[PDB]
């Protein structure tokens, strides 16, 4: 849970959060989330990727 909260801290709001509360990513959070999505694709392709 701590890791997930830290992720939400760096990547910023969800899009569903945008429609729900009008609450969106900051520019740094936009960059963080795009990186996160590319790093989640990397783990989907390889679930055993080293830390």
């Amino acid at each position: 849970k701590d890791t997930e909260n830290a992720i939400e801290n760096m990547v910023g709001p969800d899009w569903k959060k945008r429609w729900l509360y009008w609450k969106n990513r900051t520019q740094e959070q936009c960059v963080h989330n795009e990186t996160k999505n590319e790093l989640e694709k990397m783990l989907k392709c390889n679930e055993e990727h080293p830390a």
Binding site: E38, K41, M42, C45
Partner: protein, 51 residues
């Protein structure tokens, strides 16, 4: 022209989807890919120059 590290991004998108790729296959594919785009764009520009 693709920056020496722009070759590395072309490699990453291909590496993620499951395509073995090396900087020489990115330079040969690119030289042919941009020879064609350039000339066909020039011919569309012909189509627009005509009027």
């Amino acid at each position: 022209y693709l920056a020496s590290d722009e070759i590395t991004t072309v490699r990453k998108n291909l590496e993620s989807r499951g395509v073995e790729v090396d900087p020489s296959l990115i330079k040969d594919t690119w030289h042919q890919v941009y020879r064609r785009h350039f000339l066909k764009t020039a011919l569309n520009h012909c189509n627009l120059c005509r009027r």
